[PDB]
């Protein structure tokens, strides 16, 4: 269990605070935590929100316990680093890290583009140096180019959404970030497409891989019921409105009707959101074209579950750990089956315990996805 990992009294007390949601480590968490505590550079594909972040952090906390504070001198960079592909995912990771580090001595910080660089490069942010830092690649690259941060001081690196970090837009900035090569590297994801894994082999030397659940196409969660849309797109939104009418029943019983809508395009998301807000639906939309402060407020509201209907662009498909996720509608089916499965795993992120509803609309480009639906 968790006690097999040798958790510190702060770590054990925080794990006890995580009860009844944590009474023992998950089997994937059991496979991941002490091997990371063995310091081995590895990559783990598992269920999203399955405590894998906690499994990575506990071994990271143990490794940081073995690290001296003398490397924490002013002006240098952190030794414990984490990467996220979205500012929302990085913010959620920083919020999770700040709870565990309240009873610990690790300083937790977040870095992303589109925010106040004065606060990012602040004297108690950049110069005083922290133990735990989750950073977007753009802000980190800007800091390194402007010498606001360093890369020789790192000792433990974590790559959250590493498959998403392996994006063609995201690979170059990561390689630019790639720097002491002897640091312990751990990557976390939901699944590993093969063409990116060998890319990891570009910078790998005898690593390890930890896979969870079925080794095949693990498309269907046993706790998630799925349906196929046998209707054209033209009334499908109306059918979604009918589903909203069905969600009206979900609005009636108090069983939580937090609905997350998958939209492929930010402008299409805006048009659909204008239609839904016209349709008297309490909808909030988050996208890559949204304002950064507006996106931050919407993310805080969704964390508080303030908007029972929320639309999300390609910026917000995967990695979500949202409490009370009971309604998930792929208003646009994801262009990748991996993306569709990741959006599916974003809901019901409390684990195998919290249930939810999943409905996906079907369009003509997604016709070939019907074989993917098989």
């Amino acid at each position: 269990s968790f006690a097999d990992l040798g958790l510190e009294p702060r770590v054990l007390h925080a794990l006890q605070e995580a009860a009844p949601e944590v009474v023992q480590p998950t089997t994937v968490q059991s496979s991941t935590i002490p091997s990371l505590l063995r310091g081995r550079h590895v990559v783990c594909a598992a269920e999203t929100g399955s405590g894998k972040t906690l499994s990575y952090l506990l071994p990271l906390l143990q490794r940081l316990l073995g690290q001296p504070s003398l490397d924490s001198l002013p002006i240098p960079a952190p030794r414990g680093l984490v990467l996220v592909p979205s500012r929302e995912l990085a913010q959620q990771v920083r919020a999770v890290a700040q709870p565990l580090g309240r009873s610990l001595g690790l300083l937790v910080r977040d870095l992303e583009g589109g925010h106040g660089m004065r606060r990012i490069r602040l004297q108690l942010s950049r110069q005083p140096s922290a133990d735990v830092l989750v950073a977007t690649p753009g802000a980190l690259w800007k800091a390194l180019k402007s010498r606001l941060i360093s890369l020789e001081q790192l000792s433990f690196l974590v790559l959250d959404e590493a498959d998403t970090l392996l994006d063609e837009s995201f690979l170059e900035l990561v390689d630019y970030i790639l720097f002491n090569p002897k640091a312990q590297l751990v990557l976390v994801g939901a699944t590993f497409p093969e063409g990116v894994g060998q890319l990891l082999n570009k910078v790998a030397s005898p690593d390890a891989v930890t896979t969870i659940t079925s080794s095949k196409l693990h498309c269907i969660m046993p706790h998630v019921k799925q349906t196929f849309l046998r209707l054209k797109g033209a009334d499908k939104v109306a059918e979604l409105v009918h589903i909203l009418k069905h969600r009206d029943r979900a609005e009636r019983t108090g069983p939580s009707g937090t609905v997350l809508v998958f939209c492929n395009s930010s402008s299409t998301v805006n048009w659909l959101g204008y239609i839904l807000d016209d349709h008297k639906i309490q909808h909030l939309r988050l996208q890559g074209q949204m304002p950064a402060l507006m996106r931050v407020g919407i993310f805080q509201s969704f964390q508080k579950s303030s908007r029972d209907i929320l639309l999300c662009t390609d910026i917000a498909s995967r990695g979500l750990d949202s409490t009370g996720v009971e309604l998930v509608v792929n208003y646009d089916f994801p262009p990748t089956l991996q993306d569709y499965i990741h959006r599916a795993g974003r809901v019901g992120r409390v684990g195998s315990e919290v249930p939810g509803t999943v409905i996906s609309f079907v369009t003509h480009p997604w016709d070939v996805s019907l074989v993917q639906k098989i």
């Binding site: 063995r38 310091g39 081995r40 550079h41 001296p68 504070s69 003398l70 312990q184 005898p206 690593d207 390890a208």
Partner: peptide, 29 residues
Amino acid sequence: RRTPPLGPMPNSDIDLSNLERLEKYRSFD
């Protein structure tokens, strides 16, 4: 995997609980 040092790692014993109690290289010589 993770290769650690085969022999004794440098700066291991001289750390101790009180790092500030070390004499420290005050002179560069």
